[PDB]
Point group: C5
């Protein structure tokens, strides 16, 4: 990592292995859901201002051999010449995104600019290597658990959209689509009530979550139910 020191000069320190392994362990593999690690790495590329060697550790630690390779070739394919167009000219490709340690000096504007570009291309590589295969069955398979809160269920449903479709569940144009899955795949008592809401067309995803919470939050405690049964006094 690099940071601007108190003396106006960049200062280097290696990644703590705890950060690298924490990032790995708190995310799905790149293959499972490329968006996760891509977003994490995009962030780190900014906050940690990694050098070329730092980037090798990032990639080497978070990606498998086969994933890293895909990303690196995708990054080299993203290089542009001075005319803003793709280039497969070895010298240009190598200069932008070197596969072997470059002589970039972070204390120089020249070194810094190469680092900026390298990081940008690395990100591009990951974005393009991503392309997670679609599988709508995975989205239909997200069903609210009997103890699962509506907001927790919605987050799992959105994660499935991200991983297994090309649709961003946060896009305004996807709201009715996510809303319909949310209603259909909520726990049955909740889904039946959401379906019956007055002016259903007018409900945002946030509205639906709040309405589902009212039903969920009306969970009718096990103890309460048992007490009712006891006080049933209806025999057979």
């Amino acid at each position: 990592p690099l940071r601007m020191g108190g003396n106006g000069q960049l200062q280097y320190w290696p990644f703590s292995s705890s950060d690298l392994y924490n990032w790995k362990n708190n995310n799905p593999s790149f293959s499972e859901d490329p968006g996760k690690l891509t977003a994490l790495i995009e962030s780190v590329l900014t906050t940690h201002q990694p050098t070329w060697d730092d980037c090798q550790q990032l990639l080497g630690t978070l990606l498998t051999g086969e994933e890293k390779q895909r990303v690196l070739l995708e990054a080299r394919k993203a290089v542009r010449g001075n005319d803003g167009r793709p280039t497969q000219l070895p010298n240009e490709v190598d200069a932008a995104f070197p596969l072997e340690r470059p002589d970039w000096d972070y204390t120089t504007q020249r070194g810094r600019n190469h680092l900026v570009l390298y990081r940008q291309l690395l990100l591009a590589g990951m974005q393009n290597a991503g392309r997670s295969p679609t599988n709508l069955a995975k989205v239909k398979g997200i069903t609210q658990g009997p103890n699962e809160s509506p907001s927790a269920f919605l987050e799992r449903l959105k994660e499935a959209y991200r991983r297994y479709t090309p649709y961003d569940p946060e896009d305004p144009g996807q709201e009715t689509n996510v809303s319909m899955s949310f209603i259909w795949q909520s726990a049955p008592d909740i889904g039946r009530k959401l379906e019956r809401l007055e002016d259903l067309k007018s409900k945002t995803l946030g509205d639906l979550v709040r309405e589902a919470e009212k039903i969920f939050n009306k969970r009718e405690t096990p103890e309460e139910r048992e007490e009712r049964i006891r006080r049933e006094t209806e025999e057979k």
Copy 2:
């Protein structure tokens, strides 16, 4: 994070992911009990002096997509014009609480002031987004376990008040209310003795905990009880 360097100049460093994940893992979700994370974030906003990007990591890591959205809209709704009144004027709202990365420079008084305001609005957003649904049954359901100390039980009871009522269990005006729940929901031997205390009306919550501890601390060890039984010598 930002801190005043030894040279009188602000110094930046990114959050350690271990801190972010520790904060997440040691607290309930925002939806479960908004007070928990809100108080943690209020503290961090001060001690860590986060930039706008840092705040995005905080929110992005500690809140779900749906929670973050609620908070961000609530924060924008908290923006005030120069006349101290609410404003929905896009330029004013955007200038105070930008949804996209602003050009705020922390080395400038201008940048610092925007950061201060941003953090204040973020906190407001969380406070207002909170509004955890009420559920008195949850408070009545907190019952002292057979091995649970009176002070540990009281902390669980207060946590239920915080999460599932609008009442602050630490307010002086709530003391008799919390006291009555504490007496009623203590383990039966303890509750019966607390109920019989002389000048019960005069007992603070702290007094009641100390009296319950005397009974609890009189637990009559299992070994002791067994020994007594053995030395029973009373046959049938």
Copy 3:
């Protein structure tokens, strides 16, 4: 935390949450055994030179709501006027141990002195709030386990003295008392041999541990015992 920077100026940084949670998780609650956390906090108050806000995080993280309250009132009760005597004068109490954030500036001798006093009073508060209820049965209940080394058993026995009696097991005047519990509550083979030691009155606690280790260290391996049995050749 504060530390003297390389430039001769105090430098501030917030507590890592990992430290706070580690301190919490590696100790009993304050109520269970006040000495543990009190000693930890006394140490931290020195090494970490916490500000008033830092102290709020310490207390807020390591103590329950009810424990913190006890400590804070005990700290305010420990305030002394300029005549070295207790004072309940609101302005004096508030000035020494404020319940709300004070304007103390650590870059000023004035601020530093208030911080020193605050920390001293905080410690006093914890020491006085402590007063763990006595329970001799807990001390008598510490019995050496069949696999437990004599030194490990002695440490558990001393911990019970600390938590459940007013006697410090490290005091020279308590040595024979701890020694007698150690002999009586050691594993039976060990206790019978320690009781038979020549010049028993002359044995220190350290001597007794070493003598018990000789017996323990003569554990007669399970394998060895089994082998002996096999080579028994005595039939019925």
Copy 4:
């Protein structure tokens, strides 16, 4: 560790034990698979710029007594005289790779050069001590699990090549070899389809993984299968 300070002077700090133990715990032992720890140490030797004492902690923590010994003798065997040839002259060997703490001062070009050489020789020692015994059966024993993704299986297969053969599975000359193992040892449905691919000779390892993913990603959900069975309506 050493790093260039903000003042243009090297700065020393000891390894955090968390890093050392994390490195140990996230890798196989040196004996099991020398490549793992060798690559980790090669990286650290650069990013952390360890002193001679730091190197002793690295080795002492990551290697067993017997492994460290092998490495140290291998490192001393890698020393070269000024004529670029091996030397077993005690003074030359001792000067390059001392077994006891040297007087190297990192603030001097002399000290720095010795440190550079020491680290280079340490790496050489590890590389040469490596020589993991071959065992082709271990490579043939890597079979894709019923829930295991093709990319995860390929990474396990490559790990076995690294640990139990002298062949680098990333070498271009090994691609058909790894490809054949990948096809043969994939789950049976996948392997049969990969074997039937048109222009199979033209498929890279990456192509084969993508083709296997299409089959795997066609997993035919358990729920789906069950539903089909239910709707079977074919009785006996």
Copy 5:
């Protein structure tokens, strides 16, 4: 801890509790095997350059009350007068190894020298307090497990020599002794083959480990064995 700052001045920071607890948790107790913690503390005394208070935390965290006491008295017994001989003169003993916080100022050569001596005496104290009781049965009880590699077994065997004998298993004069235990206590197939090696007297401990690995590495996979059995075709 202390370190030389970038400004040529010592800089202080308290131990992270994570380091202290990691050191504790990754080692046997002092009583179990004094060598472990003694070596760890000897290292830390150098890399972390602890003050007197830091040393109290080290000892207080890594040793039990009874162990620390032994160490402290042993350290005071190691103090030497200006004539290089032992001294029990209170003032000399107290000046070298104070039991209560001394006024040592690390910014002074006087303070630094006392710190150096204190650390040296602390180490001496631990070395002398060590003296782990002998128990040859423990060494004979180290037997290679059926899945245990020869190098892993040898490390466990050496650990038993360290903990339960006065012999250093790394001494050149102990090699044949450790070698004989290694051969005798290896898994039976391995031990029988090592015993039959040509020029056995000439085999180093490293040679024996490599020969045992050849046999172990010839483990004859369970799958392989099963396959052989199946293809047995010999019926009864």
